Amino acid sequence: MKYLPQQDPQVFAAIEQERKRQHAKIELIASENFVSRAVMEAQGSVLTNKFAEGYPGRRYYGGCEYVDIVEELARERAKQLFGAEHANVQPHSGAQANMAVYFTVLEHGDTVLGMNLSHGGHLTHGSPVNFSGVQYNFVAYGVDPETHVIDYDDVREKARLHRPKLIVAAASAYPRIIDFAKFREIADEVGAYLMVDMAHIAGLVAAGLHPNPVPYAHFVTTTTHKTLRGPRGGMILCQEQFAKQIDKAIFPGIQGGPLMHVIAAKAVAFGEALQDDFKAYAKRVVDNAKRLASALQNEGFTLVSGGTDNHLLLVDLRPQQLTGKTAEKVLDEVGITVNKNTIPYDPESPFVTSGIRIGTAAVTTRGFGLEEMDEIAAIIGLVLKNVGSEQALEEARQRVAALTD
Amino acid sequence: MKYLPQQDPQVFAAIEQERKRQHAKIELIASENFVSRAVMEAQGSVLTNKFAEGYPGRRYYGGCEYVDIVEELARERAKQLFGAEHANVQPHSGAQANMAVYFTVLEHGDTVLGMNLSHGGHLTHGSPVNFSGVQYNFVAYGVDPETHVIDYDDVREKARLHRPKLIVAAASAYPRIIDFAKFREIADEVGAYLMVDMAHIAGLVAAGLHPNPVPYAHFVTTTTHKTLRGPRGGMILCQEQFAKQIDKAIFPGIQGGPLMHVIAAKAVAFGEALQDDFKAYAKRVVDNAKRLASALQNEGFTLVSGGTDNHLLLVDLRPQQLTGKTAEKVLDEVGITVNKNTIPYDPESPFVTSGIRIGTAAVTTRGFGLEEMDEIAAIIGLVLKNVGSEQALEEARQRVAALTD
Ligand SMILES: *Cc1c(COP(=O)(O)O)cnc(C)c1O
Ligand SMILES: *Cc1c(COP(=O)(O)O)cnc(C)c1O
């Protein structure tokens, strides 16, 4: 940086602390990643200066010839990546992408069927403290109490009983592949739209490592960050039949001016995801997750669903008589970043939990492989088995430091 | 830029076109500005990598010690600038800031009183194609048909008749000072909350050149871009009594993860606005607007309200028998960027209009002064009086080129 350090010492000092933190810590929060310098440069561009309400070639303000090229690059590359008939790259966030789809197809009070939030569903899939559960009538389907896999018969029974106008599939804490064909079959049976929120798994979908929801869903929402490794923001994919409505829901429905610099960054990240090396990256993410899962089981830990099909795993800490909160706190002391997470049928509150959620996307981006996964598992074992031993925690701290160099 | 040009030639080429466009054109769109290199550097930072749901010292994820410092810098500086009891710097946009306030105090179907959209009100103040008019029952107050000043007796009569739960003041196309004391008096009479959306005038408010809504309003919403000259995004200011509710409305109510890099950029822009030279800048904005207004009147143009108290003016093109659409198009041909804008009681549709809206914030940022205002007025006169003369338009083009160098 050249201008920020002189203009704003306080902000610069805090940014520099954050940069050093990102390097020093082991980032295992499953939604986290590190974007490329190219992506950041696009976000740091003069495109922040442009008001571009509307869409490419159909803007409400003049002077948009070049931002149109950028937005179209983002839309076309997204269509290449995911095979969707239409893309909308303007959502400010995953939350706003979801908001717009709900705005498109639902009226206030309509019934919507989503994944149980305590079983892996997202806040925007019907939390009573979120606009989703306040604005619409959410009902929930669950995972099996033993296998922790979505119970598709439960999805079906809930859909037939409650007659939702919309069914939502996808999750922020579900470690197995989701069967979109089955969701669509159930949707079809009850005459419901199907929305898939692929935010967590979008990079995996792009790399052909998770089945693609696009062919099965009327609407697919996503973040551009997370496994897709782009800037923070949202995107909607859909069939051409809903394109006009989706575009209108975003603007003038729920947003104003788009963030053209972030859209530039989205185009860049989509460019990166189209490359062969991104596919290799994503395979290493899933390989690392599988390895870390097996290594954790070797250390004596129980995993929700007994492992993982994707980038993420959930540790059921009940056998160790620990809460997620305790584990998260002690791991923080040694430089490992996880989050407490409810496990299915958790006897604890969402503020305490019986679990921790772990993902490999971030550590894979920094070049960690199988050997590093074994060592991360060994460190986690050392820490969680010796929570009252400062000797053990210092050893962990040193081993964490060895990994991040 | 160092990495973007190699990684993504297509995106880089389009960005470079946009950068050159920003320099070559005369930007008169009243909401536009140019941010500092420091602001852009903050937006281009590694803070995009951080998930920070929640608030400083009350986050739902670990590792937020440094982004907390950044967000608190933004909140404290905003409180210094505007004298508010509480700031929320997380809204992704002006639209989301408004969305959150509505979410805080209103139920679906509640009556809200806002400025007539054709008289200067914003899309988010009750457009039937926007979430505001779909979700709530909007009624409108108007400006006087002659003076084009808000009719405060109309505000009062509408409030007494319709009994709104919320009254909204502020505008995207209103060239005079808004009397917040009078709005609050009317709000008090009918037991309505008062919300002021100061997006357009926020930089002027910060510089003491427009009366501050904070002392009079329960809630103040704003963009951080526009006259405030920050990155694109939103902010909510409010009394401490509503702080908890406002924070909860933003998250977990309407958004997910905040954009911490944009929040850094917000802190930077607030730092800049606190400086003496920003105050001098803002005075030049208003001085330039007054000068440009008078110079346009000298060229024979009629202005809505007969002039301006702020950064913006509206030309009533009816005396020249032109639509806003025609004027906007021809000005675009010579390198002057305006927008068509409805004038109060416009006989034309919002897609055609009888007006153009013009603001001086952007040209002032690039160092234009009174002499430049006279010349911009002279060029606009030359063009709009000779729409069928290619000779005249080429002369205009050359004079525009002389100004931008
Ligand atoms: C992260 C996430 C979101 C929300 O994205 P934000 O950008 O944080 O609003 C929505 N759905 C799922 C499944 C997510 O993981
Ligand atoms: C620009 C504006 C908004 C919306 O801000 P976005 O960031 O474009 O959503 C809201 N209110 C007023 C008065 C505005 O001028």
Residue tagged 């997750």 (tokens): A289
Provide φ and ψ at A332, rounded to 5°. Answer: -55, -40
Query: β-pairing, B312-316 with B355-359?
Result: antiparallel
For chain B, the helix, strand and coil percentages under 3-state DSSP, each to the nearest 5: 50, 15, 35
With beta carbons less than 8 A apart as the criterion, state whether A167 and A141 touch: no
Method: X-ray
Asked if B47 is an interface residue toward chain A (Cβ–Cβ < 8 A), one would say yes
Write the CA distances from B127 to A201, A249, B183, B226, B314, integer angstroms: 36, 13, 21, 21, 21
Q: Which ligand is nearest to the CA of A172?
A: 1
User: In this structure, what token pair is assigned to residue B314?
Assistant: 């509206």
- Pick from B117, B123, B125, B172 the residue to mutate for probing ligand 2's pocket: most ligand atoms within 8 Å of its CB: B172
SS3 sequence of A295-362: HHHHCCCEEHHHCCCCCEEEEECHHHCCCHHHHHHHHHHHCEECEECCCCCCCCCCCCCCEEEEECHH
Sequence letter at residue A3:
Y
Q: Which two tokens stand for residue A384?
A: 């969680």
Element of type H or E holding B339: strand B339-340
Measured torsion, CA atoms of residues B389, B394, B400, B403, in degrees rounded to the nearest 10? -130
Side chain identity at A377, as an amino acid letter?
A: A
Measure the CA–CA gap between B234 and B263, rounded to whole angstroms. 10
What ranges do the domains of chain A cover? 1-32+284-405, 33-283
Q: Which residues of A301-314 are buried (b: 16+ CB within 10 A; e: fewer)?
A: bbbbbbebbbbbbb
Specify which residues A169 forms β-bridges with.
A196
Output the six-digit token pair for B196.
Answer: 């002021």
Residue with tokens 């739209």: A193
B367-393 core/surface letters (b: 16 or more CB in 10 A; e: else): ebeeebbbbbbbbbbbbbeeeeeeebb
What's at A255, amino acid-wise? Q
Residues 299-328 of B with CB under 8 A from A: 328
- Amino acid letter for position B2: K
Task: Specify whether the CB–CB gap between B285 and B204 falls below 8 A.
Answer: yes
Cβ neighbors of A164 (< 8 A, separation 6 or more) are: A110, A111, A112, A113, A139, A158, A190, A192
Q: Compute the distance between CA of residue A193 and CA of residue A113 in angstroms, rounded to an integer.
A: 10
Secondary structure (3-state) at A58: strand
Nearest residue to B24 (alpha-carbon basis) of A42, A60, A68, A66: A66
- Judging contacts by C-beta atoms under 8 Å, the chain B residues touching residue A2 are 37, 41
**Beta strands at B339-340 and B355-359: parallel, antiparallel or unpaired:** antiparallel
User: Quick one: CA dihedral B226, B232, B234, B237, positive or negative?
Assistant: negative
Tokens of B371: 């002499």
User: How far apart (Å, rounded) are the C-alpha atoms in residues A213 and A208?
Assistant: 11
Q: Look at phi and psi of residue B127 and say left if phi exceeds 0, alpha if psi is from -120 to 50, else beta.
A: beta
DSSP B87-147: EE---SSHHHHHHHHHHHH--TT-EEEEE-GGGT--GGGT-TTSHHHHHSEEEEE-B-TTT
Cis check for the bond before A252: say yes or no (omega within 30 of 0): yes
Query: Residues 234-263, chain A: which have Cβ within 8 Å of B?
Result: 248, 252-257, 259, 261
Q: How many residues does chain B have?
A: 405
User: β-strand B137-141 against B312-316: which pairing, if any?
Assistant: unpaired
Query: Helix, strand or coil for residue A207?
Result: coil
| CB interface of B with A, residues 124-143, below 8 Å | 124, 127, 129-131, 134-135
Alpha-carbon gap, residue B314 to B308, rounded angstroms? 9
Pairing of strands A166-169, A111-115: parallel
A61: nearest CB among B61, B96, B339: B339
Residues whose CB falls within 8 Å of the CB of residue A267, separated by 6 or more in sequence, listed in order:
A42, A70, A71, A73, A74, A77, A89, B8, B10, B11
Nearest listed ligand to the Cα of residue B250: 1
Contact at 8 Å (CB) between B234 and B247? no
Who lines ligand 1 at CB under 6 A? A 31, 93-95, 98, 122, 124, 170, 172, 197, 199-200, 223, 232, 234; B 256-257
CB neighbour burial string for A122-131, b if at least 16 within 10 angstroms, e if fewer: bbbbbbeebb
Report how far ligand 2's centroid is from the alpha carbon of B168 (Å). 14
User: Are residues A233 and A225 in contact, defined by beta-carbon separation less than 8 angstroms?
Assistant: yes
Judging by beta carbons within 10 Å of its beta carbon (0-12, 13-18, 19+), is residue B353 exposed, middle or buried? Answer: buried
Closest CB to A43: pick one of B44, B63, B93.
Answer: B44
Interchain CB distance below 8 Å, A49 and B66: no
One-letter amino acid of A379: I
Distance CA(A23)–CA(A404), nearest Å, equals 7
Structure token digits, residue B388: 């069928």
Residue type, B48: T
Q: Which CATH class is domain A33-283?
A: alpha beta
What is the B105 CA–ligand 1 centroid distance (Å)? Answer: 25
Hey, what are B57's tokens? Answer: 């010292």
Tell whether A17 lies on the interface with B, counting CB pairs under 8 A: yes
Strand partners, A221: A197, A236
DSSP 8-state class, residue B228: G
Q: Inform me whether the C-beta atom of residue B3 falls under 8 Å from chain A C-beta atoms.
A: yes
**CA distance linking residue A397 with residue A377, whole number of Å:** 14
Closest ligand to Cα B226: 2
Cα of A232 to nearest chain B Cα, Å: 6
Q: What is the amino acid identity at position B255?
A: Q
Beta-bridge mates of residue A193? A166
CATH node for A1-32+284-405 = 3.90.1150.10
CA distance B134 to B302: 36
Round to the nearest angstrom and report the end-to-end CA distance of chain B: 24
Q: Which residues pair with A348 in a beta bridge?
A: none
Candidates A12, A46, A225, partner chain B, best to mutate (most B CBs within 10 A): A46
In DSSP terms, B337 is beta-bridged to B27
Specify which residues A27 forms β-bridges with: A337
Q: Do B42 and A94 touch (CB under 8 A)?
A: no
CA distances from B271 to B38, B46, B80, B84, B353 (A): 11, 20, 10, 16, 39
Q: How far is CA A379 from the centre of its chain?
A: 26
In single-letter form, the type of residue at position B170 comes to A
Centre of ligand 2 to C-alpha A10, Å, is: 29
B residues 194-233 closer than 8 Å to A (CB): 225, 231-232
Burial class (CB in 10 A: 0-12, 13-18, 19+), A210: buried
Long-range contacts, stretch B318-323, CB < 8 angstroms, 24+ apart: B318/B354, B320/B384, B320/B385, B322/B384, B322/B387, B323/B348, B323/B352, B323/B353, B323/B354
Chain A closest CA to B197's CA: distance in Å?
14
Q: Which residues contact B247 (CB under 8 A, 6 or more apart)?
A: B55, B88
Instruction: Please count the helices (runs of H) and the strands (runs of E) in chain A.
Output: 16, 15
- Coil, strand, or helix at residue A389? coil
Please name the amino acid found at residue A164: P
Helix, strand and coil percent figures for chain A, each rounded to 5:
50, 15, 35
